[PDB]
Design a protein around this ligand. Structure first.
Ligand code: PCW
Ligand code: LMT
Ligand code: LMT
Ligand code: SOG
Ligand code: SOG
Ligand code: PFF
Ligand code: NA
Ligand code: NA
Length: 442
């Protein structure tokens, strides 16, 4: 007896609650900042349109048709065929992403706690930068908040699809959006807008002569859409034929892009206002945003509201991360949902511990050459497993399915849009992924 979404809106809100999270505010800010701004942004937007939306609809189609996990969907639909390595890669991508995703989500909790206990109301004597560096370098303090966030994620995944994942507050996501628009409006009035908006929207094409910017653009695209690791195959496996998938794919990609763009209009005028470099790195928003909340009279409550709504977005994103291997181990080992969520959840928490330490005592340690542990596991997950698993997912429908079945299961016809969707799964998206892989790694 497999689970289904109880409500009709349950599927689209789950997929939206999974795509909109830390990647839109935290990750989109520091990757766009260190990749130059507008030229990376255009490549990113182009990848969202011509690669992201089709592969999202591909994941939806695969999951609903098979009614099975990330891996089981390929076993079921193509028995004995090697397409299930994408689900396998997707499962491993969940262990890795959620490991460090919970570290960054723990930072949200720590800042939330400091705004409840009235600590970060005024600037600390070491500044907002030094406050952040001292917290993340601390060996044990980030672990406490990381484990705290993981317990919240395990709890919801253990409760189930009907009573846990789907019972997410329908108001927190539109409230996060209203606050980002209000805050993007405020930072436009701080003095660095002309330089922040030019950085964000006036392209410097000299950046685009670097293979790494395309690789960072395709990774941020796959990351922010919860794409390439079967998470949308999993959420699609709980929906019935009473659903139109193409509108869901466009809506998730459209809304998810709206957050990142607005998050950019909020962050970068503030960065140039504070005279800060756009390449600050992973802790950019954690240094820039507390400064912004300090310049506001009612700023403490803004930070309280911001880190509540942001953590809620991270909470629902982590739930879809954990649900991917959990659905695997429920079928594969006949584990119960509570046993798999707790076991895998505790394990993934341990996996992220070296990522948390790599901001401090393990900062000198590297795995892949020139990247620390956090950046090494983020790289192989976001830059290797997510884009390759997406490429295989696209070739699966484009070349392993009959055209009529691909169109019928995705609620498309042989119209211009159906032909267009089949064209990008068959050629545009996988070849673009291929060219980005080839040009980046020599
Ligand atoms: C080093 C990483 C080794 C591979 C990691 C994935 C893995 O080994 O984790 C266990 C999987 C799950 O096994 P399964 O769901 O595919 O069922 C068994 C069906 N059988 C027999 C065709 C595989 O085992 C496998 O896939 C075996 C690995 C085959 C595909 C990974 C290629 C590397
Ligand atoms: C967000 C909602 C989550 C609900 C869970 C509620 C958890 C409540 C338990 C709080 C435990 C905090 O634990 C305690 O936090 C304070 C900060 O306030 C730390 O404070 C310490 O760390 C910082 C480093 O950033 C030092 O600069 C500071 O001088 C020092 O006092 C303590 O070393 C730690 O022992
Ligand atoms: C409440 C619903 C939320 C949804 C949308 C809300 C939008 C929020 C807009 C807040 C933007 C405030 O932006 C802030 O406004 C005042 C002017 O009003 C500016 O203040 C500036 O102009 C005013 C008057 O011209 C002077 O008092 C001040 O000396 C000067 O610094 C701030 O430099 C600017 O940072
Ligand atoms: C609200 C979204 C609109 C943001 C658009 C900003 C992108 C173009 S900025 C533009 O860059 C030029 C040189 O780069 C300067 O000559 C101009 O003074 C300046 O206007
Ligand atoms: C709680 C709602 C806050 C929404 C976020 C927008 C922040 C803008 S607040 C703004 O800060 C100024 C100081 O520059 C005050 O002088 C103004 O009176 C006040 O309007
Ligand atoms: N898409 C989420 C992160 C994510 C969730 C689920 C995934 F399967 C992958 C990635 C974000 O942008 O924060
Ligand atoms: Na996102
Ligand atoms: Na989310």
């Amino acid at each position: 007896g497999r689970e289904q979404w109880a409500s009709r809106l349950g599927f689209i809100l789950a997929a939206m609650g999974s795509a909109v999270g830390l990647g839109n505010i935290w990750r989109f800010s520091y990757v766009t900042g260190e990749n130059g701004g507008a030229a990376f942004l255009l490549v990113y937007l182009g990848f969202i349109a011509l690669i992201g939306i089709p592969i999202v609809l591909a994941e939806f189609t695969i999951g609903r048709r098979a009614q099975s996990d990330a891996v089981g969907s390929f076993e079921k639909l193509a028995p004995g065929k090697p397409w299930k390595v994408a689900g396998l890669m997707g499962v491993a991508a969940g262990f890795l992403i959620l490991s460090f995703y919970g570290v960054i989500a723990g930072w949200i909790l720590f800042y939330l706690f400091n705004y409840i206990t009235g600590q970060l109301w005024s600037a600390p004597a070491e500044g907002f930068g030094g406050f952040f560096e001292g917290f993340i370098a601390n060996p044990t303090l980030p672990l406490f908040w990381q484990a705290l966030f993981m317990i919240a994620t395990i709890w919801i995944v253990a409760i189930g699809v009907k009573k846990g994942i789907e019972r997410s507050n329908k108001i927190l996501m539109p409230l996060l959006g209203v606050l980002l628009i209000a805050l993007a409006i405020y930072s436009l009035t701080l003095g660095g807008a002309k330089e922040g908006l030019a950085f964000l929207f006036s392209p410097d094409w000299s950046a685009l002569k670097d293979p790494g910017v395309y690789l960072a653009a395709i990774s941020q695209a796959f990351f922010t859409l919860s794409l390439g690791m079967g998470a949308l195959i999993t959420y699609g496996s709980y929906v019935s034929k009473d659903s139109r998938l193409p509108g869901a794919a466009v809506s998730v990609a459209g809304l998810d892009t709206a957050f990142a763009i607005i998050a950019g209009i909020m962050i970068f005028p503030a960065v140039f206002a504070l005279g800060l470099s756009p390449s600050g790195g992973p802790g950019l928003v954690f240094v820039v945003l507390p400064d912004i909340f300090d310049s506001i009279r009612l700023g403490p409550i803004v930070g309280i509201a911001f880190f509540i709504l942001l953590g809620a977005a991270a909470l629902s994103s982590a739930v879809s991360l954990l649900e991917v291997p959990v659905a695997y181990f429920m079928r594969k080992f006949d584990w119960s949902r509570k046993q798999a969520a707790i076991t895998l959840g505790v394990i993934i928490t341990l996996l992220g511990i070296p990522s948390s330490l790599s901001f401090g005592v393990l900062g000198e340690v590297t795995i892949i050459p020139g990247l620390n542990i956090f950046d090494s596991v983020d790289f192989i997950a976001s830059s290797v497993f997510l884009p390759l698993g997406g490429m295989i997912i696209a070739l699966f429908i484009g070349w392993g399915w009959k055209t009529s079945d691909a169109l019928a299961e995705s609620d498309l016809t042989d119209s211009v849009w159906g032909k267009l969707w089949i064209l990008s799964l068959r050629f545009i998206a996988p070849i673009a992924i291929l060219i980005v892989f080839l040009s980046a790694f020599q």
